[model samples]
Target: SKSDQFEYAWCLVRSKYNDDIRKGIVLLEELLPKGSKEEQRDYVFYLAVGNYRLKEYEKALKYVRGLLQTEPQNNQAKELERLIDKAMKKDGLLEVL
Candidate 1:
């Protein structure tokens, strides 16, 4: 079920935390396409975050842009995009916490 997939990805992300965000990226990539709309939304958000943590800023921007296409008013995605841009400009990390 999509719920199960979403839950699995969510749990995986939380369990991995900042120590291993790539695992969360893997889960999201393998499962997000099969998820429901809401699930996909959160999945994209996490995917962006995971990529951002990995310093794959262009990939992160793509995912965040996908979310913004669907939800222009998404504050989380907007904030994330802003942080991504900031990090890209500074060529380093931002206080994304």
Candidate 2:
């Protein structure tokens, strides 16, 4: 279920194992089409984060940019795109925390 998936996904997002992070992104993708844009917003954010953590900046930018198509002025959404852009140069050690 998405409830447990969400909990597991959240843990993996912050988990040390890079492969675990990738698996979490898959779970979030599974939840994506099942949700409304309202719900999609949060899930997309997490998906973006999962990629960003994986240093999959290009994919992270896509999911974040995906959020922008729905909520144009979303601060957190735009914020991450900038972050992903920079991380493409060099990167940070931060996670969803």
Candidate 3:
């Protein structure tokens, strides 16, 4: 059952349809704690990307930070960290203006 859930969640994350990204986020969140170490890594990455796509920078940063805690040199997570930080700064600027 966990494997099935992981496969389905992976499929949702990999889907090209824009609407599926949010669905992936939900499923990934539900499955993260139950996943294997490798699966959790993948889940965190996907959740970050999905949230980024949705302009949810704070949420994306949360997942990215989680991943970086384990693998500080993870290039993908490093890039996402920059992106999320940039977006969050931009959002703050927009609100201040």
Instruction: Please identify model 2 stretches exceeding 4 Å from their true place.
Output: 90-97
Clashing residue pairs found in predicted model 3:
none
Taking all chains together, each candidate's TM-score versus the true structure is: 0.78, 0.81, 0.79
Weakest ten-residue segment in model 1 by summed lDDT:
88-97
Error of 3 at 61 (Å): 0.9
**Residue-by-residue lDDT tens digits, candidate 2, 1-97:** 7678778887887789998888888887888888776877988998999999887788889889889998999999988888888887564435432
Candidate 2 lDDT (Cα, 0 to 1): 0.84
User: How many residue pairs clash in model 2?
Assistant: 0
TM-score of candidate 3 on Cα atoms, chains taken together: 0.79
Query: Each model's C-alpha lDDT?
Result: 0.82, 0.84, 0.86
**1-97, model 3: which lDDT tens digit per residue?**
9888867877776788867877878998899888888888988898998888888888888889989999898998999899899999998999989
By TM-score, the best candidate is 2
Give the Å error, residue 41, model 2: 1.3
Q: What C-alpha lDDT, on a 0 to 100 scale, does residue 24 get in candidate 2?
A: 84
Ranking by lDDT: 3, 2, 1
